[PDB]
Design a protein around this ligand. Structure first.
Ligand SMILES: [Zn+2]
Ligand SMILES: [Zn+2]
Lengths: 192, 134, 132, 195, 8, 176, 196, 114, 48
């Protein structure tokens, strides 16, 4: 209670810290790490900011304004009026359309303030999501010029086809429930 | 046609009935005689865009009751009777609900206090005894 | 009739009235008075009546032949604190005598009990025991 | 008695309530049991407080609390609630007037006592739950009187601020000029004094 | 009793 | 016309006794109860005491204890608990079955809160033109039961063991 | 001797407990008789992760007295006799217009979608009851007795008071949901209004 | 967004897709009723949860004696000078000390934030 | 420590168990001494 504001960090001191050190507790109450910058990063505040961004855990939930799960039978139909332009541009030379298109759509809006604060890139987020889920997720990203940052996600086109003659009637989670599970996992453990 | 059949003729005729919540003093005044076939007169006065309902206590019975209406659109109510001959029947559907309120404000609280004392008569309390029982 | 700048006298007059009517230990006394006056009687009345009958006694036709005994407690009475001597003669117990002689300051507790016998003889008798 | 009065004063019972109508009406709890809902809360609350101040149907110990933001009226007749007496303020004027203190001053041979003050409606008992809904003035003359506007809606006033202290702390002279741990220590030492 | 940085 | 200023006043009659008692039948608005399809209905006292009170003491009661063993058997069962309660129909809920089994089934329960300080009366039009008031003997709230397939209790236990039903529940309902 | 107030609903947040928010009510039969029986309505934390668990997220459970295992809340409402999902939500959510509260209630409804019979729900409560249950009939009658008397006694103990108990249980759930949404502040144990 | 309850069974309707017609159908699991969905949105989650508290504020709070009242800010709807002013009073309100003014005087019930 | 533009020599964590797993027993001897000295000398008190 009677530390100072100079520290600008939560610090365990006094009898509790003595007990933590004496008992060698596996989990300290306030684990902390002091990072000393090597060279120019120490001299310049902006470079230090870059290192900070490198060292601080960031998930999709931190940079996501809101998520909505839609049902769009046709990608060209563009049930959302806003995504008409860029969906049309992407489907002028469609990619992975030959496999199929999953009708269920996950639409994620990313806050520009948080995106620019952490200096994340829409292409960077798309690459990370694509790598994490392989080809099971197909991502469409707006240009940065667009006022609203929109990321459109659909289930795998190959998975939608199932690429199987038998096709199995198991129908696990259908596609909407599976998409909700994907959204929760992405938000919690994206580790962008 | 069976013992458990419900005579829905009242529902077919769409007979309309009114439900009213009335106080215990009025009901007990009615129950005092309860066999004279008369307890009062219900007077309804309607205007261009407003209707008022009032009940007058019988002069013999006493030795004004405004009625406030309530909306019945939130719940559908019907009245059914179990005849002593085991012939269930439906009398009608409730189309209006009303409440009867006392006219007196303060002096009515005196009668309420008397009713409270009457209801508290059966309540028994520990009694102090001066001399130990031998 | 407002009281301006005479408030120091007035507030202590009303405080004095409070403490004159209600003593410092009023909470304990009032709670105990509630106990004795209401709670004891309510506890007596809340208890279910005792129902007792014989276990098919005499092995006869036994058409409800075993009698039914019903007990209902009522109308609890408390006497003033009393001490009974070695002679058995009751006498009032003053609190100081209780302190000196290590007695317990207690008051006798009496209950009216009504006992009904139903022997299936077409007659039920409800004897009453007063101040048990 | 409170439940009977509430039934008289247009309180719809939970059984007769249409589930949709609950949302827009205040819920009335008596001793922790949700008796019903009332469409117009403020009129009922004023009537209940009038009855308590006249000591007609609601006893003085009964506490009525209205949570305006949560649309709940709670009435507690339970035992064990701790209460303190407070003066009542109507408009910005104390209800206690010179006639009351004149009658109290001649308390002998006038048979006017604290019970008469409670029955008159000058003072009221308020528990902590009701204290949350009460605007209090530490000192009547200073806070009630018009100044640079801080509060113009005082509802109750403290009889005297020194009554917050207990029996042992009341023997301390000039308690406000001491450090707090020292008052705490004197409260313990005074129990061990000889007399 | 003094301040936030002192004692209570 | 006369409708804008009509004043109607009628006599009130309260007969001392009526052969048929008067009750209140209340349906929830969301249920959308409609009497046009009510060609026939069956209202009767419930038998749920079959499951939890009576004829549940069928086999052990008629097993065949006799003599001293009969006396002991009866006395032992009685003293074991507090004499199991049997059918007392007047103090039991009501079951309504509209249009036989095909139509909807409703269950009415007596209003537990008694009206010790309130009474309810019903006004009905009559040819004599005077209102008649009848006291409400009882209040009943009827709630419907869907005429859909009901999960068996044993199957329900088996399904609940698999609380993590990753597969679609609708297909599971179709399988049943 | 100071004690926490009876016959009141208090919502607290316990970090150690798996439940994110727990709402407890200690009920006494007008102080006339019987020990005070506490019924807890708790909301499981979203921290637990699974394909179905993450999709459902927060799921409400109820710790009824004298039942060893936690009972899903929709099952308790069905045991009281309110089978229809709409009616249960009518008791729990006073205004259906608000979407957030209905979203909170949805997972618990999904968890209990297996049980749609009042008798089956009563049997389930009896089976998970701490006292042993020999047969289905005995379990159903025992669980009905527990609901009639042991749970929420102050609302009612007899006289077909299921509707009153349903409304008060729904009030407890409504307050727990409001606390989870953050619309109402979590209650404080130290307030002397609560400390009889 | 909103949850729709089926008429036939009075139970919750869960989303379902008809493969033949590619039409979204809200179908109960317990009963066979199916309804076409106009909204075409299944699940919406606002992580920012930037929801105005002006809707949540009740007009009844104006009667509270404990609330502070300002005559400095006039009412927009009716021009009544008095207006009780209070903060968010909400958990999970993030970090906002905005004053949510509520016009006093009977039946105005106007809530504005400056 | 592995991240670029972070000094490997001087970066230190307050948790002694992490120091033991990453740097060794001798490093923990020194780190435990440092942490105990910090808790002792925060008030300004001195222990030899
Ligand atoms: Zn349906
Ligand atoms: Zn205004």
């Amino acid at each position: 209670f009677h530390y100072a504001g100079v520290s600008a960090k939560n610090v365990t001191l006094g009898v509790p810290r003595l007990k933590e050190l004496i008992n060698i507790s596996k989990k300290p109450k306030t684990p902390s790490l002091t990072v000393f910058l090597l060279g120019q990063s120490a001299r310049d505040a902006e470079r230090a900011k870059d290192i900070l961004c490198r060292l601080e855990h960031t998930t999709l939930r931190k940079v996501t304004a809101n998520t909505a799960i839609y049902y769009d039978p046709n990608p060209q139909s563009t049930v959302v009026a806003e995504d008409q332009e860029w969906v049309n541009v992407y489907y002028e030379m469609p990619d992975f359309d030959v496999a199929r298109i999953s009708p269920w759509l996950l639409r994620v809006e990313l806050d520009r303030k948080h995106m620019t604060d952490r200096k994340l890139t829409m292409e960077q987020i798309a690459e990370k999501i694509n790598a994490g889920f392989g080809d099971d997720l197909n991502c469409i990203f707006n240009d940065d010029n667009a006022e609203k940052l929109v990321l459109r996600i659909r289930i795998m086109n190959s998975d939608e086809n199932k690429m199987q003659e038998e096709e199995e009637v198991v129908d696990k989670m259908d596609d909407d429930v599976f998409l909700r599970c994907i959204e929760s996992n992405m938000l919690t453990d994206m580790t962008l | 046609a069976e013992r458990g059949e419900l005579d829905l003729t009242g529902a077919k005729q769409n007979t309309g009935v009114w439900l009213v919540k009335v106080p215990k003093y009025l009901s007990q005044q009615w129950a005092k005689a309860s066999g004279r076939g008369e307890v009062g007169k219900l007077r309804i006065a309607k205007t261009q865009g407003r209707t008022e309902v009032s009940f007058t206590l019988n002069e013999d019975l006493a030795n004004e009751h405004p009625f406030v209406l309530q909306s019945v659109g939130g719940q559908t109510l019907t009245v059914f009777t179990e005849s002593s001959s085991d012939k269930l029947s439906l009398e009608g559907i409730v189309v209006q609900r009303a409440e009867c309120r006392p006219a007196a404000s303060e002096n009515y609280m005196r009668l309420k206090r008397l009713q409270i004392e009457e209801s508290s008569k059966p309540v028994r309390l520990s009694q102090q005894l001066d001399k130990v029982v031998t | 009739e407002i009281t301006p700048d005479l408030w120091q006298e007035a507030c202590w007059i009303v405080i004095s009235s409070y403490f004159d009517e209600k003593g410092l230990v009023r909470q304990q006394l009032d709670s105990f008075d509630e106990f004795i006056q209401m709670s004891v009687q309510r506890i007596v009345e809340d208890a279910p009546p005792i129902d007792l009958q014989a276990e098919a006694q005499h092995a006869s036709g036994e058409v409800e032949e075993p009698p039914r005994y019903l007990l209902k407690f009522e109308q609890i009475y408390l006497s003033k604190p009393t001490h009974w001597e070695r002679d058995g003669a009751p006498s009032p117990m003053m609190p100081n005598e209780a302190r000196l002689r290590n007695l317990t300051y207690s008051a006798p507790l009496y209950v009216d009990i009504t006992k009904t016998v139903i022997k299936e003889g077409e007659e039920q008798l409800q004897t009453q025991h007063q101040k048990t | 008695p409170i439940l009977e009065f509430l039934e008289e004063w247009s309180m719809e019972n939970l059984e007769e309530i249409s589930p949709a109508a609950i949302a827009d009406a205040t819920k009335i709890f008596v001793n922790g049991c949700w008796v019903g809902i009332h469409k117009d809360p403020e009129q009922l609350m004023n009537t209940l407080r009038k009855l308590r101040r006249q000591m007609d149907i609601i006893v003085s110990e009964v506490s009525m609390i209205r949570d305006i933001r949560e649309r709940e009226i709670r009435i507690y007749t339970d035992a064990g609630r701790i209460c303190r007496p407070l003066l009542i303020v109507e408009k910005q004027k104390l209800l206690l007037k010179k006639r009351h203190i004149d009658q109290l001053k001649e308390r002998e041979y006038n048979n006017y006592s604290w019970q008469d003050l409670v029955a008159s409606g000058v003072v009221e008992y308020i528990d902590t739950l009701e204290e949350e809904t009460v605007m209090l003035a530490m000192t009547p003359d200073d806070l009630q009187e018009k100044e640079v506007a801080y509060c113009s809606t005082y509802t109750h006033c403290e009889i005297h601020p020194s009554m917050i202290l207990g029996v042992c702390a009341s023997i301390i002279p000039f308690p406000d000029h001491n450090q707090s741990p020292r008052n705490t220590y004197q409260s313990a030492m005074g129990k061990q004094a000889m007399g | 009793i003094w301040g936030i940085g002192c004692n209570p | 016309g006369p409708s804008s200023q009509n004043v109607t006043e009628y006599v009130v009659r309260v007969p001392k006794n009526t052969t048929k008692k008067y009750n209140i039948m209340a349906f929830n608005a969301a249920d959308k109860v409609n009497f046009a399809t009510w060609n026939q209905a069956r209202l009767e006292r419930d038998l749920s005491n079959k499951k939890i009170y009576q004829e549940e003491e069928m086999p052990e009661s008629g097993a065949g204890s006799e003599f001293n063993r009969k006396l002991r058997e009866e006395a032992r069962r009685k003293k074991y608990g507090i004499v199991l309660k049997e059918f007392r129909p007047e103090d039991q809920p009501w079951l309504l079955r509209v249009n036989g089994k095909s139509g909807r089934k409703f269950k009415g329960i007596k209003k537990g809160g008694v009206t010790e300080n309130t009474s309810y009366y019903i006004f009905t039009q009559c040819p004599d033109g005077a209102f008649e008031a009848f006291p409400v003997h009882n209040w009943y709230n009827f709630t419907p039961l869907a005429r859909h397939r009901t999960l068996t209790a044993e199957e329900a236990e088996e399904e609940w063991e698999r609380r993590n039903k990753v597969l679609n529940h609708f297909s599971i309902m179709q399988q049943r | 001797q100071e004690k926490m107030a009876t016959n009141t609903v208090y919502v607290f947040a316990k970090k150690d407990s798996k439940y994110a928010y727990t709402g407890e009510c200690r009920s006494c039969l007008e102080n006339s008789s019987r020990p005070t029986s506490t019924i807890w309505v708790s909301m499981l934390a979203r921290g637990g992760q699974g394909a179905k668990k993450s999709a459902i997220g927060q799921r409400i459970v109820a710790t009824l007295p004298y039942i060893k295992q936690e009972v899903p809340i929709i099952i308790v409402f069905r045991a009281l006799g309110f089978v229809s999902d709409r009616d249960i939500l009518e008791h729990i959510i006073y205004d259906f217009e608000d979407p957030e509260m209905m979203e909170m209630v949805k997972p618990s409804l999904d968890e209990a979608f297996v049980i749609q019979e009042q008798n089956v729900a009563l049997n389930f409560i009896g089976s998970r009851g701490a006292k042993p249950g020999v047969t289905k009939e005995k379990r159903i009658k025992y669980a009905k007795e527990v609901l009639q008397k042991e749970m929420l006694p102050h609302v009612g103990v007899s006289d077909f008071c299921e509707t009153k108990k349903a409304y008060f249980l729904g009030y407890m759930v409504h307050r727990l949901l409001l606390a989870a949404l953050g619309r109402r502040e979590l209650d404080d144990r130290d307030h002397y209004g609560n400390k009889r | 967004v909103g949850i729709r309850f089926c008429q036939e069974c009075n139970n919750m309707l869960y989303p379902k897709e008809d493969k033949e017609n590619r039409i979204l159908l809200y179908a109960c699991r317990n009963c066979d009723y199916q309804q076409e969905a106009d909204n075409s949105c299944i699940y919406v989650n606002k992580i920012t949860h930037e929801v105005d508290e002006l809707t949540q504020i009740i007009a009844d709070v104006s009667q509270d004696p404990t609330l502070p009242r300002t005559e400095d800010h006039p009412c927009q709807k009716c021009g009544h000078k008095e207006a009780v002013f209070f903060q968010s009073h909400s958990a999970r309100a993030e970090d906002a000390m905005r004053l949510y003014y509520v016009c006093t005087a009977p039946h105005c019930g106007h809530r504005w934030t400056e | 420590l592995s991240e670029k533009d972070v000094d490997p020599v001087r970066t230190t964590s307050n948790d002694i168990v992490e120091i033991f797993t990453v740097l060794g027993i001798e490093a923990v001897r020194k780190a435990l001494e440092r942490e105990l000295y910090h808790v002792i000398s925060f008030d300004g008190s001195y222990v030899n």
